[PDB]
Amino acid sequence: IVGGYTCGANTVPYQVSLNSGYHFCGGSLINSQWVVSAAHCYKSGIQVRLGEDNINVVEGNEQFISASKSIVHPSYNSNTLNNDIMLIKLKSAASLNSRVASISLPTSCASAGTQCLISGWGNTKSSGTSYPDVLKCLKAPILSDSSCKSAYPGQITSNMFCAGYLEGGKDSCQGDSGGPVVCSGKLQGIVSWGSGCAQKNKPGVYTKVCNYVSWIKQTIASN
Ligand SMILES: [Ca+2]
């Protein structure tokens, strides 16, 4: 997260870290056994880390649970990043408490202009590299479909939205990938892609979760 703030320990209790020996992506807990992340975050041997603030210190509220199964969207296209969404099932149910909680799925898609909360342990610099140990947060508005398509001509599908600040300075970034965009208490986006981070006229692009709620529910009902 570039141009964000320290969230505060466990105030984003649905935020997970995916770990394969190191943090490599975010995710969102949607019930005690299931995490939503980005398909471009797929790898084998994922451990889900719940209840994290400082990802490099055991602070006492963590739950580490290995993935039992990953399910990349059937229509995920790694070339265009269309359908950039994946489900991860946990080997055991998380213990839900004040610091480890699920985030609601949307029933209807989010309004343009809605201020949303994006979070993660990704890079905090535009130009250069610095990865934080504690969870960072950013409040960012959903941009219009027209400004999104103008920013990335030919590349925006109906399964994507832009959020952020056209002037630059505030954005998600590498390492935030797969993490949540929460609007009005619902998981509306997944951190997916963008040209650089926090650059003028190059906002963040997010998976539009509301297009996926039928597939999420049918998948969780069968696995
Ligand atoms: Ca920790």
Please check whether residue 55 is in contact with residue 176, taking contact to mean a CB–CB distance below 8 angstroms. Answer: no
Ligand 1 center to 195 CA (angstroms):
30
Ligand 1 center to 54 CA (angstroms):
4
Resolution of the determined structure in angstroms stands at 1.5
Tell whether 133 is in a known binding site: no
- Radius of gyration of the chain from its Cα atoms, rounded to whole angstroms: 16
Q: What's the angle, vertex CA 175, arms to CA 164 and CA 184, rounded to 5?
A: 45
Pick from 186, 135, 140, 187: which is nearest to 11 by CA?
135
Q: What's the angle, vertex CA 190, arms to CA 23 and CA 180, rounded to 5?
A: 65
The single residue of 84, 119, 176, 192 carrying the catalytic annotation is 84
Please check whether residue 52 is in contact with residue 58, taking contact to mean a CB–CB distance below 8 angstroms. Answer: no
Please check whether residue 105 is in contact with residue 82, taking contact to mean a CB–CB distance below 8 angstroms. Answer: no
Domain 13-102+211-223: CATH superfamily is Trypsin-like serine proteases (2.40.10.10)
Sign of CA dihedral 189, 192, 195, 199: positive
Is 177 marked active-site?
A: yes
Ligand 1 center to 61 CA (angstroms):
8
List where CATH 2.40.10.10 sits in the chain: 1-12+103-210, 13-102+211-223
> Helix, strand or coil for residue 45?
coil
User: What values do phi and psi take at 189, rounded to 5?
Assistant: -140, 160
Ligand 1 center to 170 CA (angstroms):
25
Using a CB cutoff of 5 Å, list residues around ligand 1, an ion.
Answer: 52, 54, 59
The single residue of 17, 40, 73, 176 carrying the catalytic annotation is 40
Token output for 64:
């580490």
Tell whether 62 is in a known binding site: yes
Q: What's the angle, vertex CA 72, arms to CA 162 and CA 202, rounded to 5?
A: 20
Is 84 marked active-site?
A: yes
Q: Where are the beta strands (DSSP E) in 32-126?
A: 34-37, 47-50, 63-72, 86-90, 115-120
Tell whether 174 is in a known binding site: yes
**From which experimental method does this structure derive?**
X-ray
Q: Which fold has domain 1-12+103-210?
A: Thrombin, subunit H (2.40.10)
Identity of the residue numbered 213: V
The single residue of 17, 28, 177, 192 carrying the catalytic annotation is 177
Burial of 87 (0-12, 13-18, 19+ CB in 10 A): buried
Tell whether 168 is in a known binding site: no
> Helix, strand or coil for residue 199?
strand
User: What values do phi and psi take at 39, rounded to 5?
Assistant: -60, -30
Q: Which helix (H) or strand (E) holds 207?
A: strand 204-208
Ligand 1 center to 206 CA (angstroms):
27
Tell whether 171 is in a known binding site: yes
Residues 206 and 1: their CA atoms lie apart, in Å, by 14
Is 40 marked active-site?
A: yes
